[PDB]
Design a protein around this motif. Structure first.
Motif, mmCIF file in Angstrom:
data_model
loop_
_atom_site.group_PDB
_atom_site.id
_atom_site.type_symbol
_atom_site.label_atom_id
_atom_site.label_comp_id
_atom_site.label_asym_id
_atom_site.label_seq_id
_atom_site.Cartn_x
_atom_site.Cartn_y
_atom_site.Cartn_z
ATOM 1 N N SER D 170 1.019 -1.297 0.206
ATOM 2 C CA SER D 170 -0.044 -0.112 0.156
ATOM 3 C C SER D 170 0.862 1.765 -0.002
ATOM 4 N N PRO D 171 2.409 1.712 0.651
ATOM 5 C CA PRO D 171 2.615 2.741 0.828
ATOM 6 C C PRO D 171 3.287 3.009 -1.059
ATOM 7 N N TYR D 172 3.097 1.688 -1.949
ATOM 8 C CA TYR D 172 3.767 2.326 -3.401
ATOM 9 C C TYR D 172 2.202 2.249 -4.263
ATOM 10 N N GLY D 173 1.150 1.854 -3.656
ATOM 11 C CA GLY D 173 0.210 2.192 -4.393
ATOM 12 C C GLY D 173 -0.529 0.753 -4.797
ATOM 13 N N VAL D 174 -0.300 0.571 -4.681
ATOM 14 C CA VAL D 174 0.160 -1.336 -5.502
ATOM 15 C C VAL D 174 -1.191 -2.178 -4.755
ATOM 16 N N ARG D 175 -2.521 -2.426 -5.455
ATOM 17 C CA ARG D 175 -3.171 -3.021 -4.342
ATOM 18 C C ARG D 175 -2.442 -4.740 -4.079
ATOM 19 N N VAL D 176 -3.526 -5.246 -3.116
ATOM 20 C CA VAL D 176 -3.508 -6.863 -3.792
ATOM 21 C C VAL D 176 -4.512 -7.037 -2.565
ATOM 22 N N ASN D 177 -5.476 -7.437 -3.116
ATOM 23 C CA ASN D 177 -6.456 -8.627 -3.273
ATOM 24 C C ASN D 177 -6.425 -9.921 -3.758
ATOM 25 N N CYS D 178 -8.017 -10.881 -3.392
ATOM 26 C CA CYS D 178 -7.877 -12.688 -3.778
ATOM 27 C C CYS D 178 -9.344 -12.364 -3.958
ATOM 28 N N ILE D 179 -9.314 -13.463 -4.681
ATOM 29 C CA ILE D 179 -11.032 -14.105 -5.218
ATOM 30 C C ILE D 179 -10.759 -15.308 -4.774
ATOM 31 N N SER D 180 -12.414 -15.786 -3.924
ATOM 32 C CA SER D 180 -12.647 -17.158 -3.372
ATOM 33 C C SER D 180 -13.121 -17.672 -4.053
ATOM 34 N N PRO D 181 -13.202 -18.209 -4.734
ATOM 35 C CA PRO D 181 -14.441 -18.560 -5.910
ATOM 36 C C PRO D 181 -14.635 -19.735 -4.353
ATOM 37 N N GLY D 182 -15.982 -20.118 -4.803
ATOM 38 C CA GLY D 182 -16.921 -21.635 -4.653
ATOM 39 C C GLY D 182 -16.881 -23.225 -5.627
ATOM 40 N N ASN D 183 -17.925 -23.324 -5.655
ATOM 41 C CA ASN D 183 -18.218 -24.320 -6.579
ATOM 42 C C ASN D 183 -18.011 -23.859 -7.997
#
Lengths: 257, 259, 258, 259
Positions: D170-183
């Protein structure tokens, strides 16, 4: 106390700090407690202090140690009612670039796979006693922390594995739960604070890091563990937060300045 | 040029006259939708109409069942369909310690923040079923993790997020998705006016920016983009809480396991 | 017998079911328990059964009842250490179309605003004793339930309000926590199942909704409450799940591939 | 494309199933997509079909492969805007006694440490582009699953690591996210069902695990990823559930009242 009288508990990483608070809480509730740790200094001191505690020099990353730990517990005490997996290490602050894959693997061995191995080897005996497993995770597994990518990953794994194990062992009546501490005071914390540029300010900052305005104590983690073992018979797969409210909007809203 | 991601669709946004709500209106208009603004904020709603031919303003109080009936009637009469309802109506009271709140004030806040959403959603559902449309409730991060000096507000937003999940279960057999967005700290012109009255405006602005890991406050347009996603491209999402907070809920600002 | 000895506990909705299990758990811990409930017979019967327990005929939606509950508790004991807000009602299954705004308002009065009113009146005394508040919410506030929009909303409100109150009262050392039960076997559960087309099948579905394969007991909710009051001294703003694992894993959520 | 036109995206495990759905979604949004996957994966065929996709034979567990992946992406295209870490394997159902520490370590290498290595090597370039990271986790990391102790642990690690990385970057403006699929219906799902004595029944159970009454599609995970990359500019450290509501309400969790 007698809430866990006649029961046998194994605590990994039980030699000092949070782990010793768990050992002490179980001894005070009447249990026989086997300390599995590589911290011989602390484990022997705790054994010296507490008649119900027994220290075994034991490295949870070594399968032969874990096998011997379980067979000796059964040989000496005839049963196993509760396994508390507190073994684990928090590295110093490290930015992602200051970590290595080799270090990450080493941390997974101690913080995750040691818990896996002991739990697997204990399950036959826990089924016989309708016993339970308590994993000590961390609030940072749930909400993250900076400068701790490997540690956070290991504790997210522990909390998730707790839920998987809870599902797998539910048909046998074996509960599997975890405790997620926040900021817990220890003698190590006190020693490190004394070396800060302004110890008074560093101590106050640590106390104000959660809404309750103090840090937690090992005894409070220990009491949560005794609850999960002895009185939480309809709880399985839960994450019991012992954080003083640190995860709350304390994170305070700035929807107005 | 008008976008096409939600072209030909009809959207109702309550509390759409300014701030977060207007960002949602603008996002849907720019995606090609006809957007009906339901608000008591005529000043903001009329300004949006002037800016946006694709928006239409209706003076409308979601706490009044007759207003909600007129809103739905008229939307269907004029535009023939209803594809998405965005429940953004809601008030945040000033800071109030628990002893400074009243049961009467709490009840009034439940009427605006929770029961208005309930009433409109119920009346809209027959039309949403026809269009295989969806509901988007705007909640708040404080419903999930709390905030001080806001017991009534926090309670109302915890209710909205939970009700979203109950409605998602009830409407899933009909293919009607129900989701919520939980904003964190979102900049508005009101926020900027209030900061200027603080003892040290520069410090208050900086504090607001640093209250989340991304180091700035969010924008209404970002809440709007999340709503367009939920309406138009999230066809396997129902009952979710989409956080738009810049990371405020994360272990930021942080463990003190070492001093 | 002594884990909470001498401490003064108020339990709303304490006359039967979960509430009575909470009352019994606190009496067994050595506490002095004031039961607030509308059921005269069941309340008097618990009072008769549990020496030292006190019953007050009491409707938490009536501000005068709440004022009397607090004032007579303080007059009797001089202190108040724990308030357990268990009053609340679960309606029969209702699709959204089958609910009304008026019914929703009345459920908010029972399930949410009673907790608010009592907590507000009790807080001055809880600050003095460094006491604590325990709200009884429900798992369905966290994960939803079908055919229960009003109930789910009220319990989502209770859980969130717990966290708000925890933030407001932590400067005084007053912890505020909630317990979220899942399926707890009680006469109320039995009465709800009796309304179903096949009660036996409904009870079996209710048991199999938990990985443990059974429903919970009032005594288990009671033990969780005694823990939060007496030994969870670094817990505030938590939601303690007493659900048997119902929230875990995949299960059947639709009735008879992408 | 044009939602993500002119951008460069790396997708590990992009050859089939969910990964191929993500590749196609980004190509359709105008991005140049570099697939890191193995020889038998489908990635070579995706390059054949899609002018916007590039296939690099690449095993994320091999550090030399990851170094070559990043260096070739930068050499060819001069920039890197998004890394999607989808590499990973779901073992067949296994009780705790059917698992081994060695198997668990191998699964951590593929499912967790590959994501770690690539993200670390990509971060200098993501900082330059103000790009972002998307980790593909799983709903079962959050709520558990039966007969999957190692897999569940690895996905709990991925979700938590996402939040740690979000805080660090975040200090560099780089977002990090995840997606959690189900079935999600894929050849992998179909292969696992075929292991069962009654595959049709296992599939029906899989469909009915969601209130929506169906499984998801790779394209729906792909659309969530394009949203996170291109429009979720105030989201970091989030877990975006793509599950059809599987986590909501009560369902069947045991097999044949309070003991």
């Amino acid at each position: 106390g007698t809430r866990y009288a006649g029961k046998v508990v194994v605590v990994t990483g039980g030699g000092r700090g949070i782990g010793a608070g768990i050992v002490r809480a179980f001894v005070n509730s009447g249990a026989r407690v086997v300390i599995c740790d590589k911290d011989e200094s602390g484990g022997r001191a705790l054994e010296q202090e507490l008649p119900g505690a027994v220290f075994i020099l034991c490295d949870v990353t070594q399968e032969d140690d874990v096998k011997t730990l379980v067979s000796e517990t059964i040989r000496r005490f005839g049963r196993l009612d509760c396994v508390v997996n507190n073994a684990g290490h928090h590295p110093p602050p490290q930015r992602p670039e200051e970590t290595s894959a080799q270090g990450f693997r080493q941390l997974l061995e101690l913080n995750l796979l040691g818990t896996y191995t002991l739990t697997k080897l204990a399950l036959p005996y826990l089924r016989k006693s309708q016993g339970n497993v308590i994993n000590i995770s961390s609030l940072v597994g749930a909400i993250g922390q900076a400068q701790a990518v490997p540690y956070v990953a290991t504790k997210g794994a522990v909390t998730a594995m707790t839920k998987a194990l809870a599902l797998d062992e539910s048909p046998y009546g074996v509960r599997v739960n975890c405790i997620s501490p926040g900021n817990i005071w220890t003698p190590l914390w006190e020693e490190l604070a004394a070396l800060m540029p302004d110890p008074r300010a560093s101590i106050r900052e640590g106390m104000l890091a959660q809404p309750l305005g103090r840090m937690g104590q090992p005894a409070e983690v220990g009491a949560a563990a005794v609850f999960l073992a002895s009185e939480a018979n309809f709880c399985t797969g839960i994450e019991l937060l012992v954080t003083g409210g640190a995860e709350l909007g304390y994170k305070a809203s700035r929807s107005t300045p």
